[PDB]
A = this chain, B = another copy of it.
Amino acid sequence: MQDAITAVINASDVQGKYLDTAAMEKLKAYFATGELRVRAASVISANAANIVKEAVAKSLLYSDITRPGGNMYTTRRYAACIRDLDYYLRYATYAMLAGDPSILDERVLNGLKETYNSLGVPIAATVQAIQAMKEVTASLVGADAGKEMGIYFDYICSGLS
């Protein structure tokens, strides 16, 4: 796991130098942006259920996927699908707060490809669903925070695909 600060100091550590003025400038930038990150996290944490609900309705419902034999059909699988969507949103906001995508690659996308292939989950349908999540969450947090949530959502999409 890493942060923007942790990444900066770890890079300087690899070189073996005390924090340079350029490293300090990166750290200062992250500190300047920290308040904006905290605000955005406060917003989507409150609306997490609504974000999942809207995304599911917009892309995953009233289709063959959620009708007999569709992988979202059966209440167990429907619960699992919405649980995965909250997983994605929760880790996306973790990555947004951190300012680093190392969280997503270390946790979310380690073999997630392989699990979904085994389970029979449609990767493309999950990618569509989290794309819808990206649209909703961007609107909630605003444009500048949305383009920060957007990159982490797209990173998850790329890992799935």
Contacts and interface: CB of A to CB of B under 8 A. Distances in A.
A10 to B, nearest CB: 10
Given A14-B68, A16-B67, A16-B69, 14 more contacts: A13-B68, A13-B69, A14-B69, A15-B68, A15-B69, A16-B68, A120-B161, A122-B123, A122-B124, A122-B161, A123-B123, A123-B124, A124-B124, A124-B125
Contacts of A13: 68-69
Contacts of A16: 67-69
A160 to B, nearest CB: 11
**Copies of chain A in the complex:** 5
A116 to B, nearest CB: 11
A69 B14 CA distance: 5
A133 to B, nearest CB: 16
A8 to B, nearest CB: 15
A57 to B, nearest CB: 18
13 contacts: A13-B68, A13-B69, A14-B68, A14-B69, A16-B67, A16-B69, A120-B161, A122-B123, A122-B124, A122-B161, A123-B124, A124-B124, A124-B125
A122 B126 CA distance: 11
A123 B125 CA distance: 10
A75 to B, nearest CB: 13
Interface string A119-143: 0101111000000000000000000
